[PDB]
Amino acid sequence: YHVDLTNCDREPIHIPGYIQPHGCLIACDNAMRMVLRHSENCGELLGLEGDLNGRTAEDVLGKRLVHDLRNALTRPAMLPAMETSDGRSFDISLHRYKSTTIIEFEPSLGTARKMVDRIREADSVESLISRTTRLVKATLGYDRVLIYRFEEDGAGKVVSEAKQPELESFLGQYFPASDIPQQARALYLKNTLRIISDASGTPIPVLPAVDVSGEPLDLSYAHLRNFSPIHCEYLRNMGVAASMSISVIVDDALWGLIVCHHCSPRVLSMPVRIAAAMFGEFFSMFLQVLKQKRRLDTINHAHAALDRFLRLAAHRANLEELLVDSFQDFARLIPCDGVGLWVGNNWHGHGATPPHDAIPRLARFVASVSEGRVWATHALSQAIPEAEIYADTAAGMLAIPISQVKSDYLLFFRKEIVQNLNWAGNPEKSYETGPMGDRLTPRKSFAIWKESVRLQAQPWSEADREIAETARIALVGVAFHHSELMAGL
Numbered sequence: 118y119h120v121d122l123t124n125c126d127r128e129p130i131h132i133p134g135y136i137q138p139h140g141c142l143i144a145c146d147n148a149m150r151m152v153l154r155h156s157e158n159c160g161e162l163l164g165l166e167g168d169l170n171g172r173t174a175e176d177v178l179g180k181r182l183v184h185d186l187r188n189a190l191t192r193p194a195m196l197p198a199m200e201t202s203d204g205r206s207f208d209i210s211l212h213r214y215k216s217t218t219i220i221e222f223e224p225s226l227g228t229a230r231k232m233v234d235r236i237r238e239a240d241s242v243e244s245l246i247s248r249t250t251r252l253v254k255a256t257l258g259y260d261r262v263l264i265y266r267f268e269e270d271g272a273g274k275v276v277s278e279a280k281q282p283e284l285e286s287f288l289g290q291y292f293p294a295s296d297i298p299q300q301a302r303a304l305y306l307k308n309t310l311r312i313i314s315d316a317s318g319t320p321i322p323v324l325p326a327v328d329v330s331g332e333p334l335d336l337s338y339a340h341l342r343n344f345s346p347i348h349c350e351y352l353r354n355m356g357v358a359a360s361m362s363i364s365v366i367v368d369d370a371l372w373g374l375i376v377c378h379h380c381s382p383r384v385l386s387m388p389v390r391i392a393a394a395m396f397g398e399f400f401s402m403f404l405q406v407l408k409q410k411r412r413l414d415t416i417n418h419a420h421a422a423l424d425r426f427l428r429l430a431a432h433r434a435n436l437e438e439l440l441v442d443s444f445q446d447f448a449r450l451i452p453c454d455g456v457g458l459w460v461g462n463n464w465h466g467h468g469a470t471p472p473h474d475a476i477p478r479l480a481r482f483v484a485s486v487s488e489g490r491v492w493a494t495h496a497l498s499q500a501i502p503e504a505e506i507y508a509d510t511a512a513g514m515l516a517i518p519i520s521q522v523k524s525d526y527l528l529f530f531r532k533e534i535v536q537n538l539n540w541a542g543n544p545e546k547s548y549e550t551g552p553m554g555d556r557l558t559p560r561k562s563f564a565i566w567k568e569s570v571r572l573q574a575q576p577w578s579e580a581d582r583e584i585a586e587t588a589r590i591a592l593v594g595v596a597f598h599h600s601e602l603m604a605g606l
């Protein structure tokens with residue numbers, strides 16, 4: 118077995134058989150009686166000799182320490198400043214997973230509260246995320262701090278950045294979903310924090326990698342777990358020697374990551390990591406609440422806007438004329454780059470929309486698939502091949518029925534997503550490569566993403582769809598109310 122670009126999507130990164138060099142690791146049985154595995158550097162760090170496997174935990178660590186560890190017993194217990202029998206001092210991380218006890222040893226001020234105080238008053242998602250990269254960079258001292266937000270398809274967008282002036286910007290850039298494989302996302306979801314202390318360091322083998330019964334050691338919750346050589350190469354091509362990531366959990370899902378990159382080796386001590394993880398939890402909670410508030414404000418605004426229109430309709434004899442005069446104002450309901458009105462087989466457009474002569478084909482399509490419901494796509498050329506030609510202007514379409522009887526619609530459009538990019542990076546910046554080649558570089562990642570979203574628009578969110586359904590009911594309703602008046606006209 119060797120990992121490469123053909124099979125890295127399935128790399129079993131939870132069982133790498135190695136740890137990072139800034140600590141050592143002992144695996145014991147579920148009762149913590151016997152040593153089953155140990156990293157090769159345990160002898161050096163703990164002051165021991167030969168094969169530790171088979172020796173008892175007490176033999177290896179001391180009765181005192183084993184007692185304290187048992188008492189501490191999948192969320193790892195953090196025990197700063199513990200001592201082994203001979204007086205060597207360690208920050209110890211202890212957990213049980215799959216009924217194996219894993220003990221991690223690192224040879225070894227109100228920070229979290231003060232950091233959290235500086236974000237608690239953020240009053241929008243942007244205000245929260247902008248200040249956080251700045252704050253985390255200043256407090257933790259990394260050369261770059263980013264926040265990635267995952268799109269619905271899994272792609273990452275770099276939504277905030279604080280960096281050393283001489284580093285290139287990645288702000289507004291996207292990376293393909295495949296840049297972080299599924300197993301990596303599963304581990305990000307399980308552990309608040311992920312540390313890479315030295316990307317160019319030499320990893321330390323776990324002894325044995327595979328036990329007598331054929332089982333590998335599952336290091337899913339071990340902070341010393343080594344990382345993929347694919348990512349190692351990616352980091353090295355970027356000039357990045359160390360990282361720490363904080364998982365952003367919103368509504369029980371992985372919303373994104375706060376990622377700290379350092380151009381030289383770096384690892385935070387256990388007490389600072391505890392503070393950073395606590396910060397991450399509060400950041401996640403506050404973000405969750407701010408997203409929810411923004412959604413509420415958006416729905417509230419839309420209802421008020423629909424009421425304003427209904428108020429006008431109550432003083433107009435001719436609803437169709439009112440719609441022809443007003444339809445552009447519905448662009449305020451749902452973010453869009455254009456909007457149009459298809460009523461009585463005539464088209465009226467505003468903003469970025471398909472060309473006038475393309476509309477009858479589009480309207481026939483909408484009438485065939487709507488079935489009196491909101492219908493939406495962010496890949497219009499997949500439904501109408503001829504739409505490819507105008508994808509630069511209108512690649513996404515959301516259609517709202519506005520009559521219970523006639524095939525009349527209000528149509529919202531969005532441009533293909535590359536047209537709305539706001540990328541702060543340097544197009545002249547290039548990257549060196551290793552054996553796997555230029556795939557493992559930001560430049561190439563971004564190019565792959567751009568190619569993957571050709572002819573597609575930003576997807577219509579659940580909130581967009583909810584507003585559209587409310588608008589359908591309002592407009593179908595008022596059309597029915599005016600139907601005798603319009604029959605007369």
Ligand SMILES: *C/C=C1/C(=C/C2=NC(=C\c3[nH]c(/C=C4/NC(=O)C(C=C)=C4C)c(C)c3CCC(=O)O)/C(CCC(=O)O)=C2C)NC(=O)[C@H]1C
Nearest residue numbers: 125126287292295296297298301344345348360376559562
């Ligand atoms: C086929 C597998 C691939 C792969 C695997 C891994 N990626 C991991 C982390 C990771 N990779 C990236 C990708 C980036 N794309 C960019 O464009 C960019 C910067 C502009 C970056 C940094 C990211 C964002 C991350 C998240 C951590 C970080 O940002 O430093 C990963 C886990 C590493 C670990 O064990 O902690 C695996 C495994 N990466 C690939 O690119 C493909 C080929």
